[PDB]
């Protein structure tokens, strides 16, 4: 009964504007943004993550459309073989949690909308 | 005129005992220890580095034989392609510096030994 549409963006920095553009057309009861923001060991990465999270919250408050966050920043990721498998396995659990959260929040908004 | 002998050890933790064993036999005017101690992103690495540096200093003071340190700990090493080339290039400069330091310290000890 629920249809999912997939949109591609180059990086996490491009997510808030795409979400705002998609939300203003109606047609969607919720929006999910997924990204993997890691520390590459050369440049600082916290600025971009903070900007993306804040922008997603701002778009959510502006357009009155729920935005679920699957933008995750691990404590350590050294691109080793051990690190790859762990997060490769954990993102499935993250996706299931996001699906449950989206369903619940849409139902709750529909209920309180009388 | 100067001869160099190469000895292999499994890890940096094995260096102080090998240096002490080699020092008590005479036969060597200096000892050089080379290792690359990095943070793998899973376990803390500063304990081993601190222990190795302190043990090398202790052996140096115990046996009255100079011990040059080429045990280096980078701020960041994420095993990426960019990181590999940089340190691969820098270790040559480190080795040249170590050679000059060893020659100078041996000459200075010979001088002050009257």
UniProtKB/Swiss-Prot annotation, chains A, B:
Which superkingdom is the protein from?
Answer: Bacteria
Q: In which pathway does it act?
A: Cofactor biosynthesis; riboflavin biosynthesis; riboflavin from 2-hydroxy-3-oxobutyl phosphate and 5-amino-6-(D-ribitylamino)uracil: step 1/2
Q: Say which enzyme class the record assigns.
A: transferase
Q: Which GO terms describe its cellular component?
A: cytosol; riboflavin synthase complex
Which residues carry out catalysis? Answer: 44 (proton donor)
Provide the reaction this enzyme catalyses: (2S)-2-hydroxy-3-oxobutyl phosphate + 5-amino-6-(D-ribitylamino)uracil = 6,7-dimethyl-8-(1-D-ribityl)lumazine + phosphate + 2 H2O + H(+)
Biotechnology and industry use? Could be useful as a specific antigen for the serological diagnosis of active infection of both human and bovine brucellosis. Has been used as a protein carrier of foreign peptides and proteins. The described characteristics of BLS make this protein an ideal antigen carrier for vaccine development.
Q: Which residues bind 5-amino-6-(D-ribitylamino)uracil?
A: 12-14, 36-38, 69
Q: Which GO terms describe its molecular function?
A: 6,7-dimethyl-8-ribityllumazine synthase activity
Cite the binding residues for (2S)-2-hydroxy-3-oxobutyl phosphate: 83
> Is Cytoplasm a UniProt keyword of this protein?
yes
What inducers act on this gene?
A: The two ribH genes may be differentially expressed during the Brucella infection cycle. Brucella would use RibH1 for flavin biosynthesis during the extracellular phase and RibH2 during intracellular growth.
The reply on keyword Transferase is yes
| Cell location | Cytoplasm
Primary location group: cytoplasm
**Alphabetical keyword list:** Cytoplasm, Riboflavin biosynthesis, Transferase
The GO annotation for biological process reads: riboflavin biosynthetic process
Q: What is its EC number?
A: 2.5.1.78
By sequence similarity, the record places it as follows: Belongs to the DMRL synthase family.
Q: How does it assemble?
A: Homodecamer, arranged as a dimer of pentamers.
Q: What does this protein do?
A: Catalyzes the formation of 6,7-dimethyl-8-ribityllumazine by condensation of 5-amino-6-(D-ribitylamino)uracil with 3,4-dihydroxy-2-butanone 4-phosphate. This is the penultimate step in the biosynthesis of riboflavin. Displays low catalytic activity in comparison with the isozyme RibH1. Is a highly immunogenic protein. Activates dendritic cells (DCs) in vitro, increasing the levels of costimulatory molecules and the secretion of pro-inflammatory cytokines, and recruits DCs, B cells and CD8+ T cells in vivo, both effects in a TLR4-dependent manner.
Protein's name in the database: 6,7-dimethyl-8-ribityllumazine synthase 2
Q: Which organism is it from?
A: Brucella abortus biovar 1 (strain 9-941)
């Amino acid at each position: 009964s629920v249809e999912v549409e997939i949109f591609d963006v180059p990086g996490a920095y491009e997510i808030p504007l795409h979400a705002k553009t998609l939300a203003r057309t109606g047609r969607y009861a919720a929006i999910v943004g997924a990204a993997f923001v890691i520390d590459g060991g050369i440049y600082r990465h916290d600025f971009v993550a903070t900007a993306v999270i804040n922008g997603m919250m701002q778009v959510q408050l502006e357009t009155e459309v729920p935005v679920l966050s699957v933008v995750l920043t691990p404590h350590h990721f050294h691109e080793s073989k051990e690190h790859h498998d762990f997060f490769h396995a954990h993102f499935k659990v993250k996706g299931v949690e996001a699906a449950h959260a989206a369903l619940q929040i849409v139902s709750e908004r529909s209920r309180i909308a009388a």
